[PDB]
Amino acid sequence: GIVEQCCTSICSLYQLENYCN
Amino acid sequence: FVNQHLCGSHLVEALYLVCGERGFFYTPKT
């Protein structure tokens, strides 16, 4: 989930946007 | 701001800025 993708690895805009409504 | 390790409040704040009026969901347990 977001922690694995953006906190323990380097985040990206592509992945952040997966969590916008 | 996006292309780094973002944790906790720092991650929430990035979601806020990127998602704007869409809003977002923050689910750290998944």
If you had to describe this structure to a student in words, what would you say it looks like?
Chain A: This is Insulin A chain. The PDB classes it as hormone. Chain A is an all-alpha fold. Helices cover 52% and strands 0% of the residues of chain A. The longest helix of chain A is centred in the first third of the chain and has 6 residues. Chain A is flat. Chain B starts with 8 loop residues before the first helix and ends in an 11-residue tail after the last helix. Chain B is an all-alpha fold. Chain B has one domain. Chains A and B meet through helix 1 and helix 2 of A and helix 1 of B.
Describe the secondary-structure layout:
The complex is a heterodimer of chains A (21) and B (30).
Chain A: H1 2-7, H2 13-17
Chain B: H1 9-19
Question: Care to give the gist of this entry?
Answer:
The complex is a heterodimer of chains A (21) and B (30). Chain A has 21 residues and is mostly helical. Chain A has helices at 2-7, 13-17.
- What portion of residues of chain B belong to β-strands? under 5%
The 3D shape of chain A can be described as flat
Main beta sheet of chain B: none
Q: What structural class do you assign from the helix and strand content of chain B?
A: mainly alpha
Radius of gyration of chain A: 8 Å
Helix content of chain B: 25-40%
Strand and helix order of chain A: HH
Instruction: Give a count of the beta strands of chain B, DSSP E runs of length 2 or more.
Output: 0
Structural class computed from helices and strand pairing of chain A: mainly alpha
* Greatest interface and its participating residue counts: A-B, 16 and 21 residues
The total of beta strands of chain A comes to 0
Query: Quaternary status of these chains?
Result: heterodimer
PDB class: hormone
Keywords: Human insulin, pH-jump, pH 4.5, Spitrobot-2, hormone
Assembly: dimeric
Entry title: Spitrobot-2 advances time-resolvedcryo-trapping crystallography to under 25 ms: Human insulin, pH 4.5 (50 ms soaking)
